[PDB]
Amino acid sequence: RYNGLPSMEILGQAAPGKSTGEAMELMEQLASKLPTGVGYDWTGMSYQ
Amino acid sequence: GKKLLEAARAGRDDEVRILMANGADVNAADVVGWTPLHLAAYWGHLEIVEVLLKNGADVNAYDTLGSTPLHLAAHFGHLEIVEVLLKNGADVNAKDDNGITPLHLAANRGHLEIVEVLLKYGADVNAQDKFGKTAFDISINNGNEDLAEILQ
Amino acid sequence: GSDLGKKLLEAARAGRDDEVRILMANGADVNAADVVGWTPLHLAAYWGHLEIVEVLLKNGADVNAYDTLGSTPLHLAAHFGHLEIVEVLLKNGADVNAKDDNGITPLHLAANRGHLEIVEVLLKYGADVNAQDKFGKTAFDISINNGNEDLAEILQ
Amino acid sequence: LPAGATQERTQKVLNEVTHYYLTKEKNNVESVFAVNGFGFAGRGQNTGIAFVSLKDWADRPGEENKVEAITMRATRAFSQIKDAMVFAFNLPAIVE
Amino acid sequence: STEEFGKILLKVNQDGSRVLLRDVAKIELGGENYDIIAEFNGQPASGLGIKLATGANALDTAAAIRAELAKMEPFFPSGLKIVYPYDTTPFVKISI
Amino acid sequence: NKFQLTPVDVITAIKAQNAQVAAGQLGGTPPVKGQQLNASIIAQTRLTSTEEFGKILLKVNQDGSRVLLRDVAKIELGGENYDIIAEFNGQPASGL
Amino acid sequence: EDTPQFKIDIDQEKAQALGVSINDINTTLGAAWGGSYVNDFIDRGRVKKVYVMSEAKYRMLPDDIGDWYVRAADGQMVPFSAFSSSRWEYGSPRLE
Amino acid sequence: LGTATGFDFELIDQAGLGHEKLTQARNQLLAEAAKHPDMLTSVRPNGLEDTPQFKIDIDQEKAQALGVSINDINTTLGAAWGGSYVNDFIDRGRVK
Amino acid sequence: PGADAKTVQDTVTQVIEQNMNGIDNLMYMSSNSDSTGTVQITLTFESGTDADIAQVQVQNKLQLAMPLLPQEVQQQGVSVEKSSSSFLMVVGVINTDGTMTQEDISDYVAANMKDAISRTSGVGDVQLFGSQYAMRIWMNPNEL
Amino acid sequence: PGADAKTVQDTVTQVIEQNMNGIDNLMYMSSNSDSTGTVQITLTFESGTDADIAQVQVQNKLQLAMPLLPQEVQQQGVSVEKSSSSFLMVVGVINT
């Protein structure tokens, strides 16, 4: 659970040549095509 | 009449006078069936009791559970209200829905002179309540030795 | 339990049609089974993967495989409301009246979850409407305990 | 309202308070959020509260359209209401 | 669910018939309590009355609340909307 | 012993008869609309005196006879404990 | 201000005589007219409460008190009216 | 500091979709990610996948009919297969 | 739940109050006990008291009183808060399609919005105007 | 002891989580509940937060949710600890 709601933590990284900034943006982009009611949040190192 | 109920409760002596001068109902009742007479007996307003009675209030009005203004007086030890009510024809032996009399209530709270007064007005010492208890049973159970012999 | 078998058990569960297709071409054991005796067909029936059910059956999967508590793929498909899968299984010979170790049938299970269309399909293919579980309960009994009036009338 | 008062009667009174801001302070009152059963002293069938938000200061020119005159006008209107204590008040500069 | 509570088995009779909870009770979702009922301009509403923690900055906490609210909104059921009936905070920012 | 009783029976009777019971309300929320009466139900309240503790009813004998707390015990106000006794220049005292 | 309250006296002797336990009496009285938080259940993934209480129509009128029954040790159903009595008195709804 | 490589993403159930539905979205997102080897690499769950579990149902009616208490059933199962912490003893002067 | 004011006062309030001692910088203490079943005890401190420590000191005393409280009071949860007494703001929620009732909205708010607003820094207290859903078992004495 | 992941989550984790309110400087909260019968809830605070104040604020909110936890969990106890610290050394003790 994350912030009191059911959650699933996902780890990953940028491909060689890419910035994690770039890789995060694509995740947000992909995350935005998910079914109704699914959200997301950045935690830990990403939050920082 | 709602104003008379409230005034009687508050003890407002002249508000009770004005309101009856202006035609309010002496036997107006609230949600639980209490009359201004019930209210004055409960809080101890001798003057209002006497005024209400002089203006034809039912001295035997009962609430929604069968209790009368004498029950309240005798329960709460208001001696000067108890004699007055009695002098105006209060059912000295009135029972509420529980079978409880004013003598029961006086005996339970240990109001000795009240019991004496209730007795002289002819209270049934043998009167039982729904649990078959007399005032004597109460005096014994409560360990009031004084009261117990006054009931002999 | 073989290697490609393990891969097949996972692919079926995960509903990866393409991987399953390739595995079929390579001869991955369709009769592979995990510790609790689930076959790829159990897994696909459970998680609702229709195509993989069809493909497994094309490739010799035991339509009537049972797990270690006696439950079949039809049990799972009926319980979890997978209508098209229930019909495919029945067409391919699934025992409509199969009882598990508890004497429970696909009909009991469908009725319990209130799956009306599935109940009807199971009755169509000859489900025994009077079948009793180990507690002597029928699907009708299950219907009325649940307070399911629609289903209760279906089972008359 | 007096203790003993029902939830229904507290709603009757809240209706009148809402009505007043909605119809007699159209120029000034933007919204009313009325709560039955909650009051400053805490929960109860006989208690309630209205949170009033006003239109922006620029649309309320003059002393007559400010919180003091508004609440005074409103308390005066509400004083007609039967068997209830109803009053509007500005929260003090600092409170406490 | 209510269905599951309804079929709770209270007892089994002499003739073996079943006494279920739904045989002695009506079973529904409903409030933990029924004392507090809120309207926004006469329309059905709920809300959150927020109190500022001792010594906290009002403007900062208002911001944090707004930011938290924004995260919720996309997942609202249809028609659900946040309104802003009472905020002491804009007066601080604007007056300054 | 004469009454075939133990401290367990005493303790049980006290917990039962020196009780303060939450008994609910007449006409409480959610009510039936139209309800005029709202009143607290008052059941058992804590005992306040040695006389009340004395008449606690331990048991009724088969011959209708009553066995009360005062028939098996002395009842009085007294210290939570008796370990600490103070004197001021020889005279009985207390202190902080 | 003080308001009317419904004072009900449990008769300890009759209760013992009939074989009805004070805990059953008080739980029945309180669960019905006051409500009782039993335990938790799960609603759409969220832990929430479970409450037991009289349906509104059986807890509005004083006469309703006797419609509730407790089971004695010997299996008999005994109406509240058999072991209790009641009276109107005044009490405080908010003690400071 | 604990690993400051890559990103750390939280997929969240914002309505009441539930575990199975959240797994499906996770898988959906994981599928899409793997289609961008050019931008995303080794994108994976930090947690664990679902596993077979032995679901046992107690038949209330048959338990009631045989006169077996649910508490005895559930204590017997839990204590035996799960273990139960009963109380403490003292081993060479240390509580255990 | 279900308690009258005197029951609340004599079974809960007095017990917590008698345990309020050895609290630094306390100017005074007040409380209400009502026939809703509810208690509020307010401890007011000197200006410049650290509110973190005040809250800590109050709760340390309260924990001594807790085992002494009725089981049902404990299970409703008692809380200790450090906040202003007036409202900072009221966040309102409506449904503009009228496809959710007062009760629906209140439950959605309690179940989806309130906790996160309650955990937000600077938020001392949150009142729900409404109520979360609960499983309601409404008994019938005739059938019983 | 003996609890599956969901039992832990739905009788322990959710209850604690619903009580983590009114704590200062919280950035986020995370937890897992697993079939070893374990919950860990980790609350992360703003850099510069006093770690002692954060811990006591968390412990006090927990302490007040303890009566809502299962008896056997209250029995095992619930530990609150600073988590972001690391080991100076590990001393192994073996038998050869």
Author numbering:
A (entry chain B): 818 to 865
B (entry chain E): 15 to 166
C (entry chain D): 11 to 166
D (entry chain A): 578 to 673
E (entry chain A): 242 to 337
F (entry chain C): 194 to 289
G (entry chain A): 722 to 817
H (entry chain B): 674 to 769
Question: What's in the article?
Answer:
To further assess the proposed proton-relay mechanism and its influence on the conformation of the TM domain, we solved the atomic structures of four AcrB variants, namely K940A, R971A, D407N and D408N, all of which abolish the drug-efflux activity of AcrB. In all cases, the crystal structures represent an asymmetric configuration of the AcrB trimer. Electrostatic calculations for the R971A and D407N crystal structures indicate that, like K940A and D408N, these variants lack the ability to bind and release two protons. In R971A, like in K940A, a first proton is already bound to the protomer in the L and T states (alternating between D407 and D408, respectively) and a second proton binds in the O state. In D407N, like in D408N, only one proton is loaded (on D408), and only in the O state. Thus, also in these two variants is the key ionic interaction network at the R1-R2 interface partially neutralized in the L and T states. The R971A and D407N substitutions, however, not only perturb the energetics of the conformational cycle and the transduction of the proton electrochemical gradient, but also seem to preclude the protomers from adopting all the native-like conformations, particularly the T state. The structure of R971A shows that K940 is engaged only with D408 in the L state (while D407 is protonated). In the T state, K940 switches towards D407 (while D408 is protonated), adopting a configuration that is arguably an intermediate between the native T and O states: first, in that K940 retracts away from the repeat interface, unhindered by the now absent repulsion with R971, while still paired with D407; and second, in that as a result D407 loses its hydrogen bond to T978 across the R1-R2 interface. The structural superimpositions shown are optimal overlays of TM4-TM6, and thus highlight the differences in the orientation of TM10-TM12 relative to TM4-TM6. This comparison shows that the T state in the crystal structures of the R971A and D407N mutants is an intermediate between the T and O conformations in wildtype AcrB. The conformation of the O state, however, is largely unaffected by these mutations.
